[PDB]
C-alpha cells in the first residue's frame, strides 16, 4: 500500500543491481555507479578501538587495502539504507536494502565479491565482531574523501553492514560522527582514480 | 504498487513534514530533525563565481548568515531528492520531493520561513539565477561540516533549489564536486551548536 516511509514499503521487483529508466542493466564494473545513502544504526559492539597498520578486506584469495586507523566502525544500514543510481541515469533511489536482496548475492556482478577471512588482515577481535561467514557478499566502497570501506551482507542475520574507519572517536553513542555518502569503488581503481572517476551531481 | 525508481512513484499522502513510525507529528524546531539526500542536477547556470564577503539569506525582515565564499551553486534537487527522518526515529526516508509538496508551504512548521529579498545580501546576478518570489519557502540547512546553506522551493516552477557555496570550482560539468548530506539547522543555533546537536547515526 504505502511506500513511505521506505523501511515500511512492500517489496518490489527491480531488474538489476543498477538499472536505467529503460530497465536496462548498468554494469557495476565502474566506480560510482551506485551510492549508499543511510542513517546507519549502531550498538555497543559497533565501535572498536585499536590501531591496525596494514588493514585489508579479503575476498575470493586476494584483498583490497584500507587506510591505517585506530577507530573501526561496524554499522548496520539495513533499516534505512537506499541506493542512488549513477548521476547520469537520473534514476535517483533505485533500490532499498530490501529490494537489493534480489541482487546482493549476484556474484556475477563485478562489484560483488565473496568474503574471504584468510586474506582479511584485521585484528582477531575485530574479525570476531564483524561476525561474517566465508562467502558473504562484500563490496568495495569509498566515502567522498576517497577513504576506502566495505559494505557486507551478513547472510546469517540478513543485515547490510557498513564497515569503515574514522580518524577519531565517533563517540560512545556515535554522537560525534557526521556520516558521508559512500560510492562503489572499482577493484582496478587507485584512490586517485576513484576520486577522479566519481561524480555526485548530474550535469 | 510500483515505487522504484522513486522519481516515477505516484504521490502518496504523508501526514506531516516529519513523522514517526506510526505517522505521528515530529517537531521541526530542533536541528537535525531531517536530512536531505540527493543526486542534484546542475546546468551551466548552476555555477557562479564571485566573492561575497557577508552573504545572507533573508526571510520574514530578518536573515541568516552564510560563510564568505567565491563559488556559488544553485542546484536542483527535485528529481532525486529525499528526506530522511531524525536518526532516533528509525523512520528512514519519509518524503520525496513530490510528497514534500504537501508540507513545503506549511509556514507553521518552525523549519520553514518565507523568503525575503530585502534582507538577502547576494548580488543581482545570483538573485536573477535563483529566480525566487518573495514568500517562497526557505529552509536553513547545513552540511556535515557545518557550512550553512539554504533549501528553497521556487513555487513558480515547483522546483527545489539547494543553494550553497564551495571552497573551490566544482568544475564546468560539476565533475569535482563530491556532495555531502544536508541537515536542517535551527534558526537559534550557532555553527557550534549545529555541529554539537547534529546526529547522523542511530544508537
Which H or E run includes B130? helix B124-130
d(CA B175, CA A49): 36
d(CA A69, nearest CA chain B) in Å: 20
Residues of A in contact with B82 (CB under 8 A): 37, 82, 92-93
Measure the CA–CA gap between B104 and B100, rounded to whole angstroms.
6
d(C-alpha B171, C-alpha A201), whole Å: 11
Contact check, Cβ <8 Å, A75/B6: no
Partners of residue A80 on adjacent β-strands: none
Contact A115, A61 (CB under 8 A): no
Omega before A5 within 30 of 0, i.e. cis: yes
- PDB resolution in Å: 1.5
Q: Which residues of A137-155 are buried (b: 16+ CB within 10 A; e: fewer)?
A: bbbbbbbbebbbbbbbbbe
- Cell numbers given for B148: 550553512
Chain A / chain B CB contacts < 8 angstroms: 166
Alpha carbons B64 and A61: distance in angstroms, whole number: 55
CB atoms within 10 A of CB A27: 12
Which chain B residues have a beta carbon less than 8 Å from that of A202?
Answer: 39-42, 79-80
Residues 154 to 193 of B: which have CB under 8 A from any A CB?
170, 173-175, 177-181
What 3-state class would DSSP assign to B191? helix
DSSP state letter for A97: H
Q: How far apart are CA A171 and CA A178, in angstroms?
A: 11
Q: How many CB atoms lie within 10 A of CB B65?
A: 12
Contacts of A3 (CB under 8 A, 6+ apart): A9, A10, B3, B9, B12
Per-residue cell: A21: 529508466
Place of cell 584468510: A118
How near does any CA of chain B get to the CA of A56, in Å? 25
Of A39, A84, A203, the CB nearest to B200: A39
Residues 6+ apart with CB under 8 A from A70: A49, A50, A51, A52, A165
Beta bridge partners of A148: A142
Residue A70, helix vs strand vs coil: strand
CA dist B173 to A83, A184, A185, A201, B203, Å?
Answer: 23, 21, 21, 9, 38
Cα distances from A54 to residues A68, A183, A185, A193, in angstroms, run 6, 22, 19, 21
CA-angle at B28, arms to B25 and B29, nearest 5°: 130
Give me the residues paired with residue A175 across strands: none
Q: Dihedral through CA A74, CA A31, CA B142, CA B139, nearest 10? A: -120
How many residues can be counted in chain B?
A: 203
With left for phi above 0 and alpha for psi between -120 and 50, is residue A179 left, alpha or beta?
beta
Q: How many CA atoms lie within 13 A of B170 on its CB side?
A: 29
Angle at A112 between CA A107 and CA A117, to 5 degrees: 95
Q: Which helix (H) or strand (E) holds B126?
A: helix B124-130
Amino acid at each position: 500500500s504505502i511506500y513511505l516511509p521506505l523501511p515500511q514499503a512492500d517489496d518490489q521487483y527491480t531488474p538489476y543491481f543498477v538499472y536505467n529508466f529503460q530497465g536496462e542493466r548498468v554494469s557495476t564494473t565502474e566506480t560510482g555507479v551506485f551510492c549508499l545513502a543511510a542513517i546507519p544504526a549502531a550498538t555497543t559492539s559497533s565501535r572498536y578501538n585499536n590501531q591496525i597498520t596494514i588493514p585489508s578486506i579479503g575476498y575470493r584469495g586476494t584483498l583490497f587495502l584500507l587506510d591505517a586507523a585506530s577507530w573501526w566502525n561496524i554499522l548496520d544500514v539495513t533499516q534505512t539504507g537506499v541506493l542512488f543510481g549513477q548521476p547520469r541515469l537520473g534514476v535517483g533511489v533505485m533500490q532499498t536494502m530490501k529490494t537489493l536482496k534480489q541482487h546482493i548475492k549476484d556474484y556475477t556482478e563485478p562489484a560483488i565479491q565473496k568474503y574471504y577471512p584468510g586474506t582479511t588482515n584485521l585484528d582477531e577481535q575485530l574479525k570476531q565482531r564483524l561476525n561474517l561467514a566465508e562467502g558473504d557478499p562484500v563490496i568495495s566502497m569509498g566515502d567522498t574523501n576517497g577513504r576506502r570501506a566495505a559494505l557486507f551482507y551478513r547472510t546469517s542475520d540478513e543485515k547490510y553492514i557498513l564497515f569503515f574507519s574514522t580518524t577519531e572517536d565517533p563517540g560512545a553513542q556515535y554522537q560525534n560522527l557526521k556520516m558521508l555518502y559512500f560510492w562503489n569503488w572499482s577493484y582496478s581503481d587507485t584512490k586517485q582514480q576513484f576520486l577522479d572517476h566519481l561524480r555526485t551531481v548530474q550535469f
